[PDB]
Amino acid sequence: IVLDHAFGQTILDKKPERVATIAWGNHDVALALGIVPVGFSKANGVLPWTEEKIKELNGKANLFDDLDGLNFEAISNSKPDVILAGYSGITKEDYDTLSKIAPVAAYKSKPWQTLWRDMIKIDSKALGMEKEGDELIKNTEARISKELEKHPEIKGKIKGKKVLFTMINAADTSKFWIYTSKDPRANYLTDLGLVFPESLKDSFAKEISAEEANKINDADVIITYGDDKTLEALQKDPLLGKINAIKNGAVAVIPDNTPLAASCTPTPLSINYTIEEYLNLLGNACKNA
């Protein structure tokens, strides 16, 4: 197997008997394909849906201690035939260091800029299951499509609505992050029927000033990580409270440090697990748009 990526070409094992994954989501792609990794990146350490699939494949979860950074000794100790990194933020040196252990399936373009469909495409190809990658993508799309046609009143409230995904901190509202269309969590919203406003363009996210906030003023609905005081807080903000979607209360707050929060960057396993919960949260927010 030949694989082209941001760092060149990778000769991969057609039948990898031992699979390691790093970064976010990559393990879910392997797992959704019936492969239990010999080790995958510990999450901030396993999400409910990742555990559910591991159990269903009669496996156990082996975790790399990837919090402070890549654990090169851990990945090496698991003895992989392939390292899945289709969605990751690896640097040129990361790729080189990792390549001394096993062939690496890196992202195609730039760090942290891989849509959930491409993540499957790269990770499945690196496992010698490119055709099965097609089916996984199709099955995942079917799950999304049948959820929206299943609840036409939620579909009706959210379709056509312009949306921005943000990271806002109540501690500091002078600066906040906007996720771009190259970000998997933002682009996922377009799979749901939402659209991007005219003020979005590259990177996966960009810092913006609250003065530049009137550029985000053409969004119908806003999504951000937060808590039960987030919306009330943003409405109280001298500048951010003047924004359309915030003023209207059309803000979808994803509870920070919950499984729902992690699923925002979608995998076929996470989508299958949290889409009802995610649509319900979006549905109510878009009611205020």
Domains of the chain in sequence order: 1-128 (3.40.50.1980), 130-289 (3.40.50.1980)
Q: Per DSSP, what are the bridge partners of residue 167?
A: 177
- Quick one: how far is CA 117 from the chain centroid? 11
Q: In angstroms, what is the resolution?
A: 2.7
- In the block, residue with structure tokens 């748009």: 289
In the structure encoding, which two tokens stand for residue 280, read together? 């319900």
